[PDB]
Amino acid sequence: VGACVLCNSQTSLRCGACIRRPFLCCKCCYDHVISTSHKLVLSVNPYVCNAPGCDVTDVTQLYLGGMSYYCKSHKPPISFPLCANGQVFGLYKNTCVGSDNVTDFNAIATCDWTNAGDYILANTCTERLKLFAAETLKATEETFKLSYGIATVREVLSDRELHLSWEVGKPRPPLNRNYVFTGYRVKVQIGEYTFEKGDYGDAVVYRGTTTYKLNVGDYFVLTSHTVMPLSAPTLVPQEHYVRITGLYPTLNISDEFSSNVANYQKVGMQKYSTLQGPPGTGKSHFAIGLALYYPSARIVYTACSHAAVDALCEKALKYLPIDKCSRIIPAVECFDKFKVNSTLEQYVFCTVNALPETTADIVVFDEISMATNYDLSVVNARLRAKHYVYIGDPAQLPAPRTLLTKGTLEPEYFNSVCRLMKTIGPDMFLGTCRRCPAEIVDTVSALVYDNKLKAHKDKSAQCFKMFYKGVITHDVSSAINRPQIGVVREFLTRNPAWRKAVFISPYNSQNAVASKILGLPTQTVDSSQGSEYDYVIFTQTTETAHSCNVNRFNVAITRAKVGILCIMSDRDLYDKLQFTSLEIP
Amino acid sequence: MAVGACVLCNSQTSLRCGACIRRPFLCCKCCYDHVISTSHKLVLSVNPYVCNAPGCDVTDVTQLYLGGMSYYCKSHKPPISFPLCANGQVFGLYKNTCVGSDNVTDFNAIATCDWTNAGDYILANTCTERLKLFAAETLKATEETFKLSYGIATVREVLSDRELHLSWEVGKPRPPLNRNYVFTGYRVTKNSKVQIGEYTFEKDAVVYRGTTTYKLNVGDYFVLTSHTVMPLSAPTLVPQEHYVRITGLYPTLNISDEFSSNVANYQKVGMQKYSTLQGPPGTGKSHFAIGLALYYPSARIVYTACSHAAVDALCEKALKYLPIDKCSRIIPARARVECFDKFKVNSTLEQYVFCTVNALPETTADIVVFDEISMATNYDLSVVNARLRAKHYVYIGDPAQLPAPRTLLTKGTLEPEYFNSVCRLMKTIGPDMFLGTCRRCPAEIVDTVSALVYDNKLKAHKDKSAQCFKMFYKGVITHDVSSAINRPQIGVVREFLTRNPAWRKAVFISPYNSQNAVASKILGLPTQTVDSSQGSEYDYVIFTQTTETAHSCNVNRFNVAITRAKVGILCIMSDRDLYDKLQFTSLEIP
Ligand SMILES: [Zn+2]
Ligand SMILES: [Zn+2]
Ligand SMILES: [Zn+2]
Ligand SMILES: [Zn+2]
Ligand SMILES: [Zn+2]
Ligand SMILES: [Zn+2]
């Protein structure tokens, strides 16, 4: 017995076919079962046929026979169907309300989350359907990992490479950071690993958790936890105040953070606030300066990824008292220059999924484009705060929707925060890029930021572009372009000053091939977000939708502080690059 | 001609913009608004607005003055003078009766774009009707003039009557060697030269197909075939007129049950001025267009379309149902391309006239049937209404099928609502008629494209053939001068071919003709391209996606590609997106 998810009317009915088993009242449960393939209704007892050996569980074929339930072939004379007059029979049938958005619920409840419109709907529906979609989406993700085969250790080459055997028949998962395995030995549980495909032979690369000498015969399954029910909304109702409510602003604010004076004020005069901080505009600067402007404020700094949390720590290590900070870590080697798992310190740095239950004066949520609605709900459910600051850039990378194979997910459907930034606009917008040369800045400014991103630097005259399709050779789940490595290898002898450049490409395997030939430090576009380097060498590798994504390209070319070389494959993005075109050797 | 009507507000003028490839007439007001907000500074009157001093190269109208009785710059102007471009106007005739425009912004973006972005065509299909025509002429003249920028090819070595080696001019670009780029061949004689027909190339050597058939020698050279672009006058669509009863058209008393499921649509045609027909693959567009004449047996009908092959298919259908003495196939004497020869030639007054848009005469008709409307541009639509003053207009085609190859468009994807005016109505307000039953394809293909591009409104006639297969295999992509090559994908078909020998009757279809050429060397099947297979049908089809690019993943291209099969189809897919949309049987990769 609980509350219907659509209209909160109390009910004893749950849909036995939905993966979340939501509470649906008599009318909502009717409108769900008649227009979907979901027919199993659970109550204080399941709505199945009470006859010996009968397997009729379809509620639309079931009848209320006194106290029991029956199909047509086993019903008593005095009986009527459970589904009639727009209601499924159940407790509190007289006290129903019904809903006006059952249509969206049906599509959320029955989709397989492979289409982009499944995520669009999960972000344009009501708040209670946003939580149900996140539960159902994550439950489908965890369940779908069951179909992937187990990874058997075929050979242990080194402490960082090995050979894997794959189960015949069952599909194989893409080997990157998004897929996390659990290792067994036959009876110990070996640990928690990830995989990546290098360049030497059939060998993969592993980055494990608990140290262990894994032997031939060990098998890796996949890391699947349990999806917890959501209770808190993605965004609490916005509260506006005319004075700074709940905070004590300082009057001796240093020069470094005086430009953001009209910003932390807005943080104090609102319940939540959204700041869009494009690359190199001092996002982390704004976040840390909030702590100095409100020096007594207990502040929780959180993000999804460990690297985004660690970056906030390295910036905090410079301007904040070390003993008043803590890095919350769950049982990846992350920031380790604070005191670990000290929940009560004034400044808490912690990933979303590992957050504890506490309160705070201000909560800062960074890298908001990487956040899912599930994450937004968890933050509100774990952190009771006077002010929530959501920091990120909808024109940067989103969370990896592993099931999404059909369609393109636009930034306004990443989460509730990104949706507001793309519709009513963000509350604050850091519009001066102080990292990149004018060529890069002006390129992304017209590419994603609608000419709002301004350059604090001159043209560097060291940003070059080259159109050179080359040869694309794919492997197990990545792409490789050696001819594009060939151009860069040529470039590194003609321009020996660029030997200090970082190689960036949309693919892990090409980076390993880049490392093998060039020797440059390699970095995927995913792991490069929130980072900066003087020189950057980028090969687009392929002409796919993955390497042509403008958000991925925005992050890629905005890693440079001095110069960049873009070996391009797609015509449009090359023609949109405001760089000096180079002649093909 | 120095005097005409302003292209924006129709006021008479003695001014034309010399920087615009079309030299449109612009009034005193419109000319000023155009020159001051763009880089177009050359204005033409009876004489060009340029400085007439010995040795001066000043041609900016904003730096010139009318002095004495000529045009001079600031350095050379006589004391008594006045500026040519000032006070909101460029000087010229009828300076008191000018109207001006409300927004030249659309005209300026049409007149200064390079037509390499998809947004350039979006504007060309959303502007006012007079700007659609100007944008049609501007795009078309840009295409033809850019053709002249390519280098000339020369035969250096002949390998057979199919393959030959080409020599190319140094320093000039070389055209992509596909079926879209047609060349005019030339052979050298004692003096001068002579034209030896038209040719297309494919795939280090190339394979050629000619309008005629010579055993061409070394030294023959090919220049991309260029065409002049006439000015446009008529709209892309006539004004709409819904009538109370069937006007100018008389139904038949009894009718065949071949075209019985079209009687509702046939009456819809006869009560509104123009009408649209969306007909998916299979379906039977030509059967409908011909049966329309049997419902109004006395109606004069002009069947038109862009390509000769599209007009030829209507002739073959009319040969089966319409009197042959009632049909005339119009063939322009210019360019003698092999077309339909079973009808009398160039009889404009015949009851059934079959003619391409480019060769249309100036006549009238009870009904005009414009077939394959997705392949048309707004230029074609304007020509049809300028040459053919009809009583009804029926546009047949499919917005989900391929459009005219926009050769200049290399950045962005053009959506069906921006193909032309007719597809714009079909994609927004919906087509007047829809043929919802597909007779050609096995049910797997039909349910796919019905859920892919047809809103599940396309109904399968056949059953599940159980011979529709799909494989996910990216393989190895290699590029050459103008296409791509996926040898591992062809090597995948080879293991499949020796496993299923009956599939040697299948047609090979890949988005690029380079991958096609390599298939006819390891496999052997007859190869086609999605654009070179539109309209026709085959038993078995073997499709290799080759790449994951926007060209290989175009939903319209993939819609046409997979709907060429009557029985079975094998898809070696690169895109996970379209692979998962294919309701086919999957296979493991050996
Ligand atoms: Zn359900
Ligand atoms: Zn309810
Ligand atoms: Zn029963
Ligand atoms: Zn002009
Ligand atoms: Zn005018
Ligand atoms: Zn002069």
Author numbering:
A (entry chain E): 2 to 187, 192 to 336, 340 to 593
B (entry chain A): 0 to 202, 207 to 593
Report text from the authors:
The SARS-CoV-2 Non-structural protein 13 (NSP13) has been identified as a target for anti-virals due to its high sequence conservation and essential role in viral replication. A long 30 amino acid linker that does not adopt any secondary structure links the 1B to the 1A and 2A RecA-like core helicase domains. The nucleotide binding site is situated in a cleft between the 1A and 2A domains with specific contacts to the nucleotide provided by conserved helicase motifs I, II, and III in the 1A domain and IV, V, and VI in the 2A domain.
We have determined the crystal structures of full-length SARS-CoV-2 NSP13 (residues 1-601) in three different forms that represent different conformations of the ATPase catalytic cycle. The APO form was determined at 2.4 Å resolution with two NSP13 molecules in the asymmetric unit. In general, the electron density is of high quality throughout, with the exception of the final 7 residues at the C-terminus and two loops within the 1B domain (residues 185–194 and 203–207), which display variable degrees of disorder across the various chains. In addition to the specific changes in the nucleotide binding site detailed above there are also significant domain movements that become evident when comparing the various chains of NSP13 structures. Firstly, the Zinc binding domain appears to be fairly flexible with rotations of 10–15° around a single hinge point located near residues 104–105. There is no obvious connection between the conformation of this domain and crystal form or nucleotide bound status as variability between chains within a single crystal forms is equally large as when comparing between forms. More directly related to the nucleotide status is the relative conformations adopted by the 1A and 2A domains which shifts by around 20° and adopts a closed conformation the Mg2+ AMP-PNP bound crystals structure, and a more open conformation in the APO, Phosphate bound and other AMP-PNP bound chains. We have determined the crystal structure of SARS-CoV-2 NSP13 in APO, phosphate-bound, and nucleotide bound states.
